[PDB]
Write an enzyme that holds these catalytic residues in place. Structure first.
Site, mmCIF file in Angstrom:
data_model
loop_
_atom_site.group_PDB
_atom_site.id
_atom_site.type_symbol
_atom_site.label_atom_id
_atom_site.label_comp_id
_atom_site.label_asym_id
_atom_site.label_seq_id
_atom_site.Cartn_x
_atom_site.Cartn_y
_atom_site.Cartn_z
ATOM 1 N N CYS A 45 2.103 3.316 9.883
ATOM 2 C CA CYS A 45 2.285 4.690 9.413
ATOM 3 C C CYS A 45 2.868 5.577 10.510
ATOM 4 O O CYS A 45 2.316 5.658 11.600
ATOM 5 C CB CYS A 45 0.970 5.281 8.903
ATOM 6 S SG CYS A 45 1.193 6.749 7.863
ATOM 7 N N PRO B 142 0.848 -1.196 0.000
ATOM 8 C CA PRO B 142 0.000 0.000 0.000
ATOM 9 C C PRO B 142 0.882 1.245 0.000
ATOM 10 O O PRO B 142 1.808 1.327 0.806
ATOM 11 C CB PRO B 142 -0.753 -0.105 1.331
ATOM 12 C CG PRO B 142 0.102 -0.990 2.188
ATOM 13 C CD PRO B 142 0.704 -1.980 1.239
ATOM 14 N N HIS C 107 6.641 -4.807 7.873
ATOM 15 C CA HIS C 107 7.710 -3.927 7.434
ATOM 16 C C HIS C 107 8.792 -4.089 8.491
ATOM 17 O O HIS C 107 8.648 -3.601 9.613
ATOM 18 C CB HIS C 107 7.211 -2.479 7.374
ATOM 19 C CG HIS C 107 8.210 -1.512 6.817
ATOM 20 N ND1 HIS C 107 7.964 -0.157 6.728
ATOM 21 C CD2 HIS C 107 9.457 -1.701 6.323
ATOM 22 C CE1 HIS C 107 9.018 0.447 6.207
ATOM 23 N NE2 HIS C 107 9.938 -0.467 5.951
ATOM 24 N N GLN D 182 -6.806 -1.241 2.798
ATOM 25 C CA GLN D 182 -6.158 -0.892 4.056
ATOM 26 C C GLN D 182 -6.839 0.297 4.714
ATOM 27 O O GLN D 182 -7.020 1.348 4.094
ATOM 28 C CB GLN D 182 -4.667 -0.600 3.878
ATOM 29 C CG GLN D 182 -3.981 -0.296 5.208
ATOM 30 C CD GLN D 182 -2.546 0.160 5.054
ATOM 31 O OE1 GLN D 182 -2.282 1.292 4.645
ATOM 32 N NE2 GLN D 182 -1.608 -0.718 5.387
ATOM 33 N N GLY E 285 7.168 -2.597 -2.413
ATOM 34 C CA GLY E 285 6.596 -1.278 -2.613
ATOM 35 C C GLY E 285 7.355 -0.453 -3.636
ATOM 36 O O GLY E 285 7.022 -0.451 -4.820
ATOM 37 N N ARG E 286 8.387 0.246 -3.176
ATOM 38 C CA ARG E 286 9.114 1.186 -4.025
ATOM 39 C C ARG E 286 9.649 0.569 -5.316
ATOM 40 O O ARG E 286 9.574 1.187 -6.381
ATOM 41 C CB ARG E 286 10.241 1.858 -3.237
ATOM 42 C CG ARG E 286 9.738 2.897 -2.246
ATOM 43 C CD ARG E 286 10.818 3.307 -1.259
ATOM 44 N NE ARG E 286 11.145 2.227 -0.333
ATOM 45 C CZ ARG E 286 12.134 2.275 0.554
ATOM 46 N NH1 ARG E 286 12.901 3.354 0.636
ATOM 47 N NH2 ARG E 286 12.358 1.244 1.358
ATOM 48 N N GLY F 44 10.266 -4.657 3.115
ATOM 49 C CA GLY F 44 11.285 -3.658 3.380
ATOM 50 C C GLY F 44 12.557 -3.845 2.575
ATOM 51 O O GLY F 44 13.317 -4.783 2.808
ATOM 52 N N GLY F 45 12.781 -2.949 1.618
ATOM 53 C CA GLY F 45 14.021 -2.916 0.865
ATOM 54 C C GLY F 45 14.243 -4.054 -0.115
ATOM 55 O O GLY F 45 15.345 -4.217 -0.632
HETATM 56 C C1 LIG Z 1 5.126 6.799 -1.229
HETATM 57 C C2 LIG Z 1 4.852 5.784 -0.158
HETATM 58 C C3 LIG Z 1 3.583 5.684 0.399
HETATM 59 C C4 LIG Z 1 3.333 4.740 1.391
HETATM 60 N N1 LIG Z 1 2.070 4.634 1.937
HETATM 61 C C5 LIG Z 1 1.775 3.576 2.776
HETATM 62 C C6 LIG Z 1 0.469 3.340 3.185
HETATM 63 O O1 LIG Z 1 -0.445 4.066 2.796
HETATM 64 N N2 LIG Z 1 0.191 2.282 4.029
HETATM 65 C C7 LIG Z 1 1.207 1.457 4.467
HETATM 66 O O2 LIG Z 1 0.952 0.516 5.219
HETATM 67 N N3 LIG Z 1 2.506 1.689 4.065
HETATM 68 C C8 LIG Z 1 2.794 2.740 3.218
HETATM 69 N N4 LIG Z 1 4.094 2.961 2.813
HETATM 70 C C9 LIG Z 1 5.180 2.039 3.293
HETATM 71 C C10 LIG Z 1 5.219 0.856 2.318
HETATM 72 O O3 LIG Z 1 3.979 0.168 2.317
HETATM 73 C C11 LIG Z 1 6.328 -0.144 2.639
HETATM 74 O O4 LIG Z 1 6.079 -0.719 3.906
HETATM 75 C C12 LIG Z 1 7.696 0.539 2.630
HETATM 76 O O5 LIG Z 1 7.807 1.373 1.496
HETATM 77 C C13 LIG Z 1 8.849 -0.462 2.620
HETATM 78 O O6 LIG Z 1 8.682 -1.378 1.559
HETATM 79 P P1 LIG Z 1 9.575 -1.243 0.224
HETATM 80 O O7 LIG Z 1 11.034 -1.165 0.626
HETATM 81 O O8 LIG Z 1 9.355 -2.446 -0.665
HETATM 82 O O9 LIG Z 1 9.186 0.020 -0.502
HETATM 83 C C14 LIG Z 1 4.349 3.895 1.826
HETATM 84 C C15 LIG Z 1 5.618 3.999 1.269
HETATM 85 C C16 LIG Z 1 5.869 4.941 0.278
HETATM 86 C C17 LIG Z 1 7.239 5.049 -0.327
#
Ligand SMILES: Cc1cc2nc3c(=O)[nH]c(=O)nc-3n(C[C@H](O)[C@H](O)[C@H](O)COP(=O)(O)O)c2cc1C
Length: 312
Positions: A92, A9, A163, A62, A224-225, A203-204
């Site tokens: 969050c 998300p 996360h 969510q 995510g990213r 995460g990452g």
């Molecule tokens: C732009 C952005 C918006 C995010 N919004 C949410 C969110 O609405 N709800 C949530 O649980 N996590 C949110 N996150 C955190 C991500 O869901 C995720 O846990 C975090 O980016 C680490 O995962 P990743 O390294 O694969 O990006 C957000 C992250 C980013 C970068």
RNA sequence: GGUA
């Protein structure tokens, strides 16, 4: 509920338009809405906030909030919209989350978390899940983590999306996904200690290869990213994770997005609401930069048609 | 209504 692979998300990212794009890349990957505050669901325009296309299944909504009754009613409404899962945001770290006492700051009050989850679980029939962090203020312990998992499991939760880092409430949201150290080993250990429960680590994680590593230790991986920076990071997902005989094409996905764009424009959707999520479709590919340029400059169906001819 |  298939927990193996999901897209995280992401506020301002994972709206219905980007989610539709992702679904073109991977049929199997599980989709999550942006964090949606319960009050918005209750008092806002539910169609604008919650409506999604059937192709987006499997998809989870969510919710964020601190009041059991409000969240329960919001979950009920979410279920009525056809979501396959109601996910509770417990991670969050934003200033607004802190002011509203939701997200990561709920991990300070396990008693509250339990009554929230109990209320939610009794309001809907679909799975109620959580997305959480390892703890708060970098003061987390493994016993504290396990205790929180136990409290939530008592409330009916079976699926835990983690996360795998702490949340430092004094830092910015961006810093909160970079600075606190990741401890995926703790999520691996949780699965070892709670075999009956489902753990999805997050995460990452930058590639499918990396996800496959963790899939040997936990039930699922959430990206995510990496996905927003380049959707085709999921190119081999259907085949290598979901055992499907399907492999997407960037050009095919782009062509599908054009037909999608025309439908959306028809009902009043601004072209840029769709196009702004298509900029990375050709990341690291020949002419990928001109693709981004054409869409970002033109911001129109006509601009997309130029980019498509460029890529045909 | 909402995490650069
Ligand atoms: C732009 C952005 C918006 C995010 N919004 C949410 C969110 O609405 N709800 C949530 O649980 N996590 C949110 N996150 C955190 C991500 O869901 C995720 O846990 C975090 O980016 C680490 O995962 P990743 O390294 O694969 O990006 C957000 C992250 C980013 C970068």
């Amino acid at each position: 509920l298939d927990p193996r692979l999901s897209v995280a998300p992401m506020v301002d990212r994972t709206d219905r338009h980007f989610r539709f794009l992702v679904r073109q890349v991977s049929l199997g990957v599980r989709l999550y809405t942006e964090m949606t505050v319960d009050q918005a669901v209750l008092r806002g325009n539910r169609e604008r906030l919650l409506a999604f296309r059937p192709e987006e299944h499997p998809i989870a909504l969510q919710l964020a909030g601190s009041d059991p009754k409000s969240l329960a009613e919001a979950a009920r409404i979410g279920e009525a919209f056809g979501y396959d899962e109601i996910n509770l945001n417990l991670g969050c770290p934003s200033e607004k989350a802190q002011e509203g006492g939701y997200g990561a700051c709920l991990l300070l009050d396990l008693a509250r978390v339990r009554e929230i989850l109990k209320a939610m679980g009794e309001a809907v029939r679909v799975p109620v899940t959580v997305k959480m962090r390892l703890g708060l203020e970098g003061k987390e312990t493994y016993r504290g983590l396990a205790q929180s998992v136990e409290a939530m499991a008592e409330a009916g939760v079976k699926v835990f999306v983690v996360h795998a880092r702490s949340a430092l409430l004094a830092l910015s949201t961006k810093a909160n996904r970079e600075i606190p150290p990741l401890r995926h080993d703790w999520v691996h250990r949780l699965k070892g200690d709670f075999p009956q429960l489902t753990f999805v680590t997050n995460g990452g994680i930058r590639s499918l290869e990396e996800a496959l590593f963790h899939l040997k230790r936990v039930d699922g991986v959430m990206l995510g990213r990496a996905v927003y920076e380049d959707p085709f990071v999921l190119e081999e997902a259907d085949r290598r994770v979901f055992g499907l005989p399907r492999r997407p094409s960037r050009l095919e996905v782009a062509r599908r997005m054009r037909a999608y764009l025309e439908e959306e424009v028809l009902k009043g959707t601004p072209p840029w609401a769709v196009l702004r999520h298509m900029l990375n479709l050709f990341r690291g590919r020949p002419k990928g930069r001109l693709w981004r340029r054409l869409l970002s400059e033109g911001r129109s169906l006509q601009a997309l048609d130029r980019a498509l001819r460029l890529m045909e």
